[PDB]
Design a protein around this ligand. Structure first.
Ligand SMILES: *[C@@H]1O[C@H](CO)[C@@H](O)[C@H](O)[C@H]1NC(C)=O
Lengths: 49, 45
């Protein structure tokens, strides 16, 4: 996926994040202890005219 | 043994624990002990 800066907050004890159906929507890195969000990149379908 | 806590109270009533507040973990002590009874320690005169 593609990583961007996160506008959300994590509690100190928790390390992962998800919204629905085991989709990791955020994560904190083990070195900077910074917060990042994960979203899939730009997959799609192709049609021809 | 996971110990949860919340300090700041709500003065909705007097001497009663009315209200709702979630609790966040503080310490999870990994000892692996079996405990069936327990007491409490106070300050005596
Ligand atoms: C790891 O080292 C980097 C180097 O500056 C530091 O910024 C970071 O806070 C360190 N993280 C831990 C968990 O020690």
């Amino acid at each position: 996926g593609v990583l961007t800066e996160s506008n959300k907050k994590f509690l100190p004890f928790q390390q992962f994040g998800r919204d629905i159906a085991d989709t990791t929507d955020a994560v904190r890195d083990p070195q900077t202890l910074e917060i990042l969000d994960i979203t899939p990149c730009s997959f799609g379908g192709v049609s021809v005219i | 043994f996971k110990i949860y806590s919340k300090h700041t109270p709500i003065n909705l009533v007097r001497d009663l624990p009315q209200g709702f507040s979630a609790l966040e973990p503080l310490v999870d002590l990994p000892i692996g002990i079996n405990i069936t009874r327990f007491q409490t320690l106070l300050a005596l005169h």
